[PDB]
Every structure is written in structure tokens, then in C-alpha cells.
């Protein structure tokens, strides 16, 4: 999926309830591969320090 339109799609299903994670991420907005290339991550890579709150929206 990486480097295709599928890297943006996280699939769910109607399976019975499970306690295992659907996805996992580390809060390293400038370095985590999944965050480093977003508009936010791109800007953070032109600076050495960051501070503040973030928000994740899921559709």
C-alpha cells in the first residue's frame, strides 16, 4: 500500500468484537513516517522545536 492511494485507506469490517488495535502511531509529528509527510509534518521539518496541541479527525 505504501506510495499508492491505498496508503491513505484503513479498512474496517463487520467481524465480531476484538480488543486488538486497528492502527498504532507514535506522537512524533515530524519524524514518524505516517506524520512526517503531511502538511503539518512538512512544515515541522523546517523547524527544530514544536509545542502545542494536535487533533486527529477520522472520516
Partner 1 sequence: SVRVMQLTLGNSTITTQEAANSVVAYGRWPEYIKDSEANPVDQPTEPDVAACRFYTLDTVTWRKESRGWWWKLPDALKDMGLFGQNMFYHYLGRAGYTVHVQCNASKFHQGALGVFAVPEMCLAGDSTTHMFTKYENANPGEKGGEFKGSFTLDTNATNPARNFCPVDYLFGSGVLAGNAFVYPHQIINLRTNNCATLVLPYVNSLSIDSMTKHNNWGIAILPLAPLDFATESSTEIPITLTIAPMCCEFNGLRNITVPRTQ
Partner 2 sequence: ANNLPDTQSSGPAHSKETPALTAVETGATNPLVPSDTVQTRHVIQKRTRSESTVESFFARGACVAIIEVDNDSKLFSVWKITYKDTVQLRRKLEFFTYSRFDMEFTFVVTSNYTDANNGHALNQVYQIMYIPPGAPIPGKWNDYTWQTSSNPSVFYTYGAPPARISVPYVGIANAYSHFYDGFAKVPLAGQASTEGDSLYGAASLNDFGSLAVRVVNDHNPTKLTSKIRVYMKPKHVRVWCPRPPRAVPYYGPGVDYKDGLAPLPGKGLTTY
Partner 3 sequence: INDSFTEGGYISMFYQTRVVVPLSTPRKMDILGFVSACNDFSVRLLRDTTHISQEA
> How many amino acids of this chain bind partner 1 (CB under 8 A)?
3
Using only C-alpha atoms, the chain has a radius of gyration, in whole angstroms, of 14
The three three-digit cell numbers of residue 30, written as one number: 515530524
The answer to the question of residue 22 lying near partner 1 (CB under 8 A) is no
Q: Is 5 in the site for partner 3 (CB under 8 A)?
A: no
Minimal distance, residue 10 CB to partner 1, in Å: 20
Told to check if 53 binds partner 1 by CB under 8 A, we report yes
Contact 12, 18 (CB under 8 A): no
Whole-number Å distance between alpha carbons of 39 and 8: 14
- The reply on whether position 56 binds partner 3 by CB under 8 A is yes
Amino acid at each position: 500500500r505504501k506510495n499508492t492511494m491505498d496508503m491513505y485507506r484503513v479498512e474496517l469490517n463487520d467481524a465480531a468484537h476484538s480488543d486488538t488495535p486497528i492502527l498504532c502511531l507514535s506522537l512524533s509529528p515530524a519524524s514518524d513516517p505516517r506524520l512526517a509527510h503531511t502538511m503539518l509534518g512538512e512544515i515541522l521539518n523546517y523547524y527544530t522545536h514544536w509545542a502545542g496541541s494536535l487533533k486527529f479527525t477520522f472520516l
